[PDB]
Design an enzyme around this catalytic site. Structure first.
Site, PDB file in Angstrom:
ATOM      1  N   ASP A  49       0.813  -1.215   0.000  1.00  0.00           N
ATOM      2  CA  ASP A  49       0.000   0.000   0.000  1.00  0.00           C
ATOM      3  C   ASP A  49       0.841   1.257   0.000  1.00  0.00           C
ATOM      4  O   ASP A  49       0.486   2.238  -0.653  1.00  0.00           O
ATOM      5  CB  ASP A  49      -0.925   0.058   1.213  1.00  0.00           C
ATOM      6  CG  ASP A  49      -2.179  -0.785   1.059  1.00  0.00           C
ATOM      7  OD1 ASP A  49      -2.399  -1.432   0.018  1.00  0.00           O
ATOM      8  OD2 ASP A  49      -2.982  -0.766   2.030  1.00  0.00           O
ATOM      9  N   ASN A  94      -4.373  -2.226  -4.177  1.00  0.00           N
ATOM     10  CA  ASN A  94      -5.572  -2.444  -3.386  1.00  0.00           C
ATOM     11  C   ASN A  94      -5.589  -1.440  -2.240  1.00  0.00           C
ATOM     12  O   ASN A  94      -6.260  -1.667  -1.245  1.00  0.00           O
ATOM     13  CB  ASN A  94      -5.557  -3.849  -2.774  1.00  0.00           C
ATOM     14  CG  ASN A  94      -5.412  -4.945  -3.813  1.00  0.00           C
ATOM     15  OD1 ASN A  94      -6.337  -5.217  -4.578  1.00  0.00           O
ATOM     16  ND2 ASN A  94      -4.241  -5.578  -3.846  1.00  0.00           N
ATOM     17  N   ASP A 313     -11.246  -3.367  11.619  1.00  0.00           N
ATOM     18  CA  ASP A 313     -10.187  -4.270  11.146  1.00  0.00           C
ATOM     19  C   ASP A 313      -9.677  -5.182  12.251  1.00  0.00           C
ATOM     20  O   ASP A 313      -9.581  -6.414  12.074  1.00  0.00           O
ATOM     21  CB  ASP A 313      -9.004  -3.469  10.598  1.00  0.00           C
ATOM     22  CG  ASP A 313      -9.238  -2.935   9.201  1.00  0.00           C
ATOM     23  OD1 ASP A 313      -8.419  -2.095   8.765  1.00  0.00           O
ATOM     24  OD2 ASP A 313     -10.206  -3.343   8.527  1.00  0.00           O
ATOM     25  N   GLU A 341     -11.313  -5.525   1.132  1.00  0.00           N
ATOM     26  CA  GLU A 341     -10.522  -6.411   0.256  1.00  0.00           C
ATOM     27  C   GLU A 341     -11.327  -7.573  -0.292  1.00  0.00           C
ATOM     28  O   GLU A 341     -11.058  -8.060  -1.384  1.00  0.00           O
ATOM     29  CB  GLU A 341      -9.286  -6.926   0.986  1.00  0.00           C
ATOM     30  CG  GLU A 341      -8.154  -5.904   1.110  1.00  0.00           C
ATOM     31  CD  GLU A 341      -8.583  -4.589   1.749  1.00  0.00           C
ATOM     32  OE1 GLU A 341      -9.463  -4.602   2.640  1.00  0.00           O
ATOM     33  OE2 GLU A 341      -8.026  -3.535   1.364  1.00  0.00           O
ATOM     34  N   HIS A 385      -5.080  -9.500   3.049  1.00  0.00           N
ATOM     35  CA  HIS A 385      -4.043  -9.599   4.073  1.00  0.00           C
ATOM     36  C   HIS A 385      -4.565  -9.988   5.445  1.00  0.00           C
ATOM     37  O   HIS A 385      -3.945 -10.799   6.142  1.00  0.00           O
ATOM     38  CB  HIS A 385      -3.271  -8.262   4.162  1.00  0.00           C
ATOM     39  CG  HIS A 385      -4.116  -7.059   4.496  1.00  0.00           C
ATOM     40  ND1 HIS A 385      -3.620  -6.012   5.241  1.00  0.00           N
ATOM     41  CD2 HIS A 385      -5.373  -6.702   4.134  1.00  0.00           C
ATOM     42  CE1 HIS A 385      -4.540  -5.063   5.333  1.00  0.00           C
ATOM     43  NE2 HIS A 385      -5.610  -5.455   4.669  1.00  0.00           N
ATOM     44  N   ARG A 386      -5.721  -9.447   5.823  1.00  0.00           N
ATOM     45  CA  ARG A 386      -6.222  -9.761   7.159  1.00  0.00           C
ATOM     46  C   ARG A 386      -6.793 -11.158   7.308  1.00  0.00           C
ATOM     47  O   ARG A 386      -6.789 -11.693   8.396  1.00  0.00           O
ATOM     48  CB  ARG A 386      -7.215  -8.702   7.621  1.00  0.00           C
ATOM     49  CG  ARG A 386      -6.554  -7.337   7.680  1.00  0.00           C
ATOM     50  CD  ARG A 386      -7.291  -6.366   8.608  1.00  0.00           C
ATOM     51  NE  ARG A 386      -6.688  -5.054   8.393  1.00  0.00           N
ATOM     52  CZ  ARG A 386      -5.469  -4.684   8.773  1.00  0.00           C
ATOM     53  NH1 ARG A 386      -4.686  -5.485   9.499  1.00  0.00           N
ATOM     54  NH2 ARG A 386      -5.058  -3.454   8.461  1.00  0.00           N
ATOM     55  N   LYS A 411       0.291  -6.511   1.798  1.00  0.00           N
ATOM     56  CA  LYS A 411      -0.455  -5.275   1.617  1.00  0.00           C
ATOM     57  C   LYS A 411      -0.071  -4.310   2.739  1.00  0.00           C
ATOM     58  O   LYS A 411       0.103  -3.101   2.500  1.00  0.00           O
ATOM     59  CB  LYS A 411      -1.958  -5.539   1.661  1.00  0.00           C
ATOM     60  CG  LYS A 411      -2.781  -4.362   1.171  1.00  0.00           C
ATOM     61  CD  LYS A 411      -4.258  -4.684   1.157  1.00  0.00           C
ATOM     62  CE  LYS A 411      -5.113  -3.505   0.704  1.00  0.00           C
ATOM     63  NZ  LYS A 411      -5.292  -2.468   1.774  1.00  0.00           N
TER      64      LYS A 411
HETATM   65  C1  LIG Z   1      -9.683  -1.738   4.399  1.00  0.00           C
HETATM   66  C2  LIG Z   1      -8.189  -1.278   4.789  1.00  0.00           C
HETATM   67  O1  LIG Z   1      -8.018  -0.420   5.997  1.00  0.00           O
HETATM   68  C3  LIG Z   1      -8.838   0.738   6.196  1.00  0.00           C
HETATM   69  C4  LIG Z   1      -7.901   1.989   6.490  1.00  0.00           C
HETATM   70  C5  LIG Z   1      -8.596   3.227   7.051  1.00  0.00           C
HETATM   71  C6  LIG Z   1      -7.850   4.512   7.061  1.00  0.00           C
HETATM   72  O2  LIG Z   1      -8.479   5.548   6.905  1.00  0.00           O
HETATM   73  O3  LIG Z   1      -6.664   4.437   7.233  1.00  0.00           O
HETATM   74  C7  LIG Z   1      -9.923   3.173   7.580  1.00  0.00           C
HETATM   75  C8  LIG Z   1     -10.683   1.863   7.590  1.00  0.00           C
HETATM   76  O4  LIG Z   1     -11.781   1.914   6.424  1.00  0.00           O
HETATM   77  P1  LIG Z   1     -13.414   2.305   6.609  1.00  0.00           P
HETATM   78  O5  LIG Z   1     -13.934   1.295   7.700  1.00  0.00           O
HETATM   79  O6  LIG Z   1     -13.433   3.779   7.057  1.00  0.00           O
HETATM   80  O7  LIG Z   1     -13.892   2.114   5.162  1.00  0.00           O
HETATM   81  C9  LIG Z   1      -9.716   0.569   7.475  1.00  0.00           C
HETATM   82  O8  LIG Z   1     -10.605  -0.552   7.444  1.00  0.00           O
HETATM   83  C10 LIG Z   1      -7.217  -2.454   4.893  1.00  0.00           C
HETATM   84  O9  LIG Z   1      -6.055  -2.299   5.398  1.00  0.00           O
HETATM   85  O10 LIG Z   1      -7.741  -3.556   4.572  1.00  0.00           O
HETATM   86  P2  LIG Z   1      -7.816  -0.169   3.289  1.00  0.00           P
HETATM   87  O11 LIG Z   1      -6.594   0.652   3.606  1.00  0.00           O
HETATM   88  O12 LIG Z   1      -7.487  -1.114   2.104  1.00  0.00           O
HETATM   89  O13 LIG Z   1      -9.081   0.680   2.937  1.00  0.00           O
END
Ligand SMILES: C[C@@](O[C@@H]1CC(C(=O)O)=C[C@@H](OP(=O)(O)O)[C@H]1O)(C(=O)O)P(=O)(O)O
Length: 427
Positions: A49, A94, A313, A341, A385-386, A411
């Protein structure tokens, strides 16, 4: 199809120096790029990322250098909005933290840029953000499915009265908050109804303040932003260790410790996922807090029934830890697990059943009843990843587990399995 088989782990104990926070890393890189001056980031995360964000900044003309381990970055700020023309395509893998923030930021001034990513990114919603950016004047075109990437951004966001739906992702508001200060006109961001994943908004505001910008937060229902501002380099900035990545190791101790200490985050952390430790404590584990560490020591593990919207998460880690708890665990108010994801409610329920659990997949909750004993399963990871990291915990039992596509952890945590092995003890 690559795979990794984890043999049973008799006990976990030790110390893990956490990789940098992905949430903080990508926000700091974008703000450093927009800022005036040179920012030196340390403890930056090296993961897919972050690499996609760095590659996008390179494509946009931003200059920076990286240390050998890619955790120290010296960024030469652009001193204003980033620009490119010719429908330059930025491939964002992603990374939601690259896609959502850049979708808004690149709407400043004139531009002609296309944002795209892996196939799954074209299935993660972005319509609420586009709707808000357009109200502020941006010209945005959906190149494939309406309400999803890829997007062609042609600029025009000047500010004004902007409404944004905060019910599906906090990232849409995050993107707007980081972008608005640089718009020529003042902006009033009104949240339509509910706001999910609220702690991530606090991370965004903390980062903006570090880079010299503050806004008026009216009980998270409306945000008043003054336009014509500029981000300023904070000089050297230390990126917090990743609290989401920490959840796996703290959970491991709650299940099979021993004591596991994670360093790089502590009681003063800005990340909402440090509250995952409170959940382990509610389940029966012992937690110790430091200025730069959080540790977990095995106590017992009892089922819980909790609203997990504040830690979406890290909540996934509780779903596999639940396999080891006494009683039925219920995690509620986690609808957006479905739009990340992979649809994580479907994936988590499917894989949990494979190792023996009885699982009710609710529309926006999951109920897990552990089996008397786990069985072996080859775990599908859904390019998530999770899923790989959560199911690694199955090996804290009498049965091995095989994880498909283990490299998907890259990721956010390329060295995940080596780090889990570091605290894995035979005695
Ligand atoms: C999903 C993710 O991590 C997200 C990162 C994130 C941020 O602002 O840093 C907020 C959350 O999304 P939301 O609940 O507000 O939509 C996490 O779930 C992950 O690491 O899987 P991603 O960074 O890909 O959106």
């Amino acid at each position: 199809m690559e795979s990794l088989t984890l043999q049973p782990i008799a006990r976990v104990d030790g110390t893990i120096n956490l990789p940098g926070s992905k949430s903080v890393s990508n926000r700091a890189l974008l703000l450093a790029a927009l800022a005036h001056g040179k920012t030196v980031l340390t403890n930056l995360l090296d993961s897919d990322d972050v690499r996609h964000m760095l590659n996008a900044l390179t494509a946009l003309g931003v200059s920076y250098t990286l240390s050998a381990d890619r955790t120290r970055c010296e960024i030469i700020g652009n001193g204003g909005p980033l620009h490119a023309e010719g429908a330059l395509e930025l491939f964002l893998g992603n990374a939601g933290t690259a896609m959502r923030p850049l979708a808004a930021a690149l709407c400043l001034g004139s531009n002609d840029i296309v944002l795209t990513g892996e196939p799954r990114m074209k299935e993660r919603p972005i319509g609420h953000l586009v709707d808000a950016l357009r109200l502020g004047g941006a010209k945005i075109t959906y190149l494939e499915q309406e309400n999803y990437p890829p997007l062609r951004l042609q600029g025009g966001f000047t500010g004004g009265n902007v409404d944004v739906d905060g019910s599906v992702s906090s990232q849409f508001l995050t993107a707007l908050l980081m972008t608005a200060p640089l718009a020529p006109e003042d902006t009033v961001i009104r949240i339509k109804g509910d706001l999910v994943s609220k702690p991530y908004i606090d991370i965004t505001l903390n980062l903006m303040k570090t880079f010299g910008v503050e806004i008026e937060n009216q009980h998270y229902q409306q945000f008043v932003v003054k336009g014509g501002q500029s981000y300023q380099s904070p000089g050297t900035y230390l990126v917090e260790g990743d609290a989401s990545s920490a959840s796996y190791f703290l959970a491991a101790a709650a299940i099979k410790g021993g004591t596991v200490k994670v360093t790089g985050i502590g009681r003063n952390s800005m990340q909402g996922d440090i509250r995952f430790a409170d959940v382990l404590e509610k389940m029966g584990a012992t937690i110790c807090w430091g200025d730069d560490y959080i540790s977990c020591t095995r106590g017992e593990l009892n089922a819980i029934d909790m609203d997990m919207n504040h830690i979406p998460d890290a909540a996934m880690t509780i779903a596999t830890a639940a396999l080891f708890a006494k009683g039925t665990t219920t995690l509620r108010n986690i609808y957006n697990w479905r739009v990340k994801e992979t649809d994580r409610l479907f994936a988590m329920a499917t894989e949990l059943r494979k190792v023996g659990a009885e699982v009710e997949e609710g529309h926006d909750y999951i109920r897990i009843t552990p089996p008397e004993k786990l069985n072996f399963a080859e775990i599908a990871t859904y390019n998530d990843h999770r899923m790989a990291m959560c199911f690694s915990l199955v090996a804290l039992s009498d049965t091995p587990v095989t994880i498909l596509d283990p490299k998907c952890t890259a990721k956010t945590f390329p060295d995940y399995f080596e780090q889990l092995a570091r605290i894995s003890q035979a005695a």
